[PDB]
Structures are given as C-alpha cells and as structure tokens.
Amino acid sequence: MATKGGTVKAASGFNAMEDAQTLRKAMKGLGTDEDAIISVLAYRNTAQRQEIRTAYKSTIGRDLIDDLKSELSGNFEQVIVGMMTPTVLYDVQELRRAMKGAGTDEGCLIEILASRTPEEIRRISQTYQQQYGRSLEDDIRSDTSFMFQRVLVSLSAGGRDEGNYLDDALVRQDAQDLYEAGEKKWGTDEVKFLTVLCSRNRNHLLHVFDEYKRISQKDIEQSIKSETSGSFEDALLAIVKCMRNKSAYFAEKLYKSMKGLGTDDNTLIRVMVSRAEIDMLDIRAHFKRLYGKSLYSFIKGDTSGDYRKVLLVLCGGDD
C-alpha cells in the first residue's frame, strides 16, 4: 500500500536452462514464436533474464541478446532488448544514445539525471566510462552548452546531500537566496538556482519550496518558468517534480509520450522498462489520479502487436 513497488516480480520455480531452451526453440524455425518469447521474458525479472542469458550461452553456445535482435525488429525488439539489459547498463546506454549523433535527446538526459538517486548515478558514471572510454561528464560537456550543461554536469556527479536533516536557518536562507537571485533581480543568478536544486537533500528542498512560496507568494515552479527558459528551465522543472514526487513525474512523462498523434516510443519504452521493478504500481496510481484514465487504457490505445503485449505486462494491470 505505502511504497507500492513494481509490477514485475520473480517467477517461482525459476529454471534458467529450461527458459533458455524455450527461447532457443522459439527462434529455431521459419517464423518466430513471439508469444513464447514474451511468455518467458516479460514474466521473469531483470535478474532472472540475466541468468537466462548465461544459461543460454552455456547450453546453446550463442548470445541471447544478439539472437533476439536477429529475429525481432521495430519497437518490439527495442523493448525486449531493453528488458534484457542489466539495470545500470540500460541507463548508460540510454544516456549514450541521447547524446550520440546530431543533436541531443534533452528529455532523456534530464529524465535520467534528475530522477536517479545519488547511488544510481555513481554506478551510471562508472559504467559509462567502462562502456565508452570517456566520462559521462566529458560527453555531456561535448553535447550540451551553457547553464543547461552546467546543471547536467552537476547532476552527473551524484553529489546530492543524503539524509533528511532540516537545518531551519539554511532553509530560510536558501529560499531567500532563490528569491534574491530571481524575482528581485534583473535577470537571474542561474547558478544559485542549480546549486540549491542539485545539492540539498530532498526533505530540505521540500521545505525550501514551502518557505519560498511563503516569502514570494509564488511557487518555485512559477518563478523558474518566469526566470528561465529552454532546456535549463526544463532541467530545473524536472528536478522539482522529482523532488516533490518521482512516481508522479514518470506518470506525466508516460502521459505526454502517448497523448496526441503517434507515440514517443523511446520515452514510453524507457520509462516502462526502467520503472517496472521500482514504482510502476505508484506510477499507475498517480497516472490515473492525474488524468482520470488508467495507464493501461493509454498503452492499449497507443500501441499494437507484440510491442503492445509486452508493454501491458510491464504495466501489469488496468485501473
């Protein structure tokens, strides 16, 4: 009830070798058995899917992920491969993809860097270096600029204060500083905003937000919107939403990824996959609260085929 949890749980009586043979069997003939692949992979958690990769490489003597890529395509392949990717590496590969090539997927960078915990970020930074031979900070600096770059670099350090300690004097001054640096200033001391928003512990910031409303008669979101713009504004706003309620933040991302013509499949897939074993239950609750419709109704109405089948398993039910 409290921290609801994920929608993908460990399968009972798990046998990695058996599941591996099922997948091998499913990809052996003229025409792939997609439902068989789903029946196994969507119903095993990330840890179990890894044991299946190992077992597959043993008995079969082949790479499970590469073979799946050879028989699958489109969005169905993208979601399956994501589900097959180890937790930290998945985020790493998403950040890399967000920056590699012309332009940058700002939404993805902001999303991962603003919603991941200090500990999840340190792991991400370490695996990014391992995977690509350059630091995450290095690539951020190469793909982004100015204050947006500045904030992303700070988030990538994973240095936010931990704990829930409330230093009242600090809360009052932070609110005052943010007020002096924005509303009462011609222009904006953007580094003060990013510094306060990136380094203070969650509880502290929630109280800073209240104190700021108290002295300025404006929500910090209203001032951020009126004081900043572009990607810097987007980053700052994401940080605030993730501080107020992370599950609600993702609910809104899901909504926005499907609302309107077509689908932002990259966002839809990344969110469903990355939060399936963490707070999908809470995301579902917040999603229906915010929009009056279940996340299930949206996924079913925006997708089809095998891709839709897998996404609905990650959703884990209607509301």
How would you label 38-57 residue by residue, b for 16+ Cβ within 10 Å and e otherwise? bbbbbebbbebbbbbbebbe
Quick note: the x/- pattern for Ca ion over 200-239, rule CB under 5 A, is -------------------------x---x----------
Quick note: the x/- pattern for Ca ion over 279-308, rule CB under 5 A, is -----------------------x------
Q: Which amino acid is at 4?
A: K
Contact 302, 273 (CB under 8 A): no
Tell me the closest approach of the beta carbon of residue 290 to Ca ion, in angstroms. 17
Contacts of 47 (CB under 8 A, 6+ apart): 10
Q: Which of 46, 87, 93, 104 binds Ca ion (CB under 5 A)?
A: 104
Tell me the closest approach of the beta carbon of residue 204 to Ca ion, in angstroms. 23
- Whichever of 51 and 183 has its CB closer to Ca ion, that residue is 183
Q: What are the start-end ranges of the H helices in the chain?
A: 16-26, 34-41, 46-59, 64-71, 74-84, 87-99, 106-115, 118-132, 136-143, 146-155, 168-181, 190-199, 202-216, 220-227, 230-244, 246-258, 265-275, 280-291, 295-302, 305-315
Q: Which stretch binds Ca ion (CB under 5 A): 44-52, 104-112, 133-141, 241-249?
A: 104-112
- Whichever of 26 and 258 has its CB closer to Ca ion, that residue is 258
- Whichever of 111 and 302 has its CB closer to Ca ion, that residue is 302
- Whichever of 1 and 261 has its CB closer to Ca ion, that residue is 261
Quick note: the x/- pattern for Ca ion over 125-154, rule CB under 5 A, is ------------------x-----------
What residue number has its CB nearest to Ca ion? Answer: 229
- CA 215-216-218 angle, to 5 degrees, is 130
Q: Which amino acid is at 287?
A: F
- Whichever of 158 and 182 has its CB closer to Ca ion, that residue is 182
d(CA 263, CA 261): 7
Q: Which stretch binds Ca ion (CB under 5 A): 86-94, 100-108, 158-166, 238-246?
A: 100-108
Q: Does 54 bind Ca ion (CB under 5 A)?
A: no
Tell me the closest approach of the beta carbon of residue 316 to Ca ion, in angstroms. 21
- Whichever of 120 and 189 has its CB closer to Ca ion, that residue is 189
Tell me the closest approach of the beta carbon of residue 208 to Ca ion, in angstroms. 18
305 φ/ψ sector (left φ>0, alpha ψ -120 to 50, else beta): left
Tell me the closest approach of the beta carbon of residue 265 to Ca ion, in angstroms. 10
Residues 241-260 that bind Ca ion (CB under 5 A): 258
Query: Which tokens hold the place of 87?
Result: 């937790």
Q: Which amino acid is at 114?
A: A
Quick note: the x/- pattern for Ca ion over 159-198, rule CB under 5 A, is -----------------------x--x--x----------
Which residue is listed with tokens 């840890």? 47
How many residues bind to Ca ion according to rule CB under 5 A?
11
DSSP-based three-state secondary structure for 33: coil
What burial class does residue 141 get, using C-beta atoms within 10 Å of its C-beta: 0-12 exposed, 13-18 middle, 19+ buried?
middle
Radius of gyration of the chain (CA): 21
Tell me the closest approach of the beta carbon of residue 219 to Ca ion, in angstroms. 14
Given the rule CB under 5 A, which residues bind Ca ion?
99, 104, 143, 182, 185, 188, 225, 229, 258, 263, 302
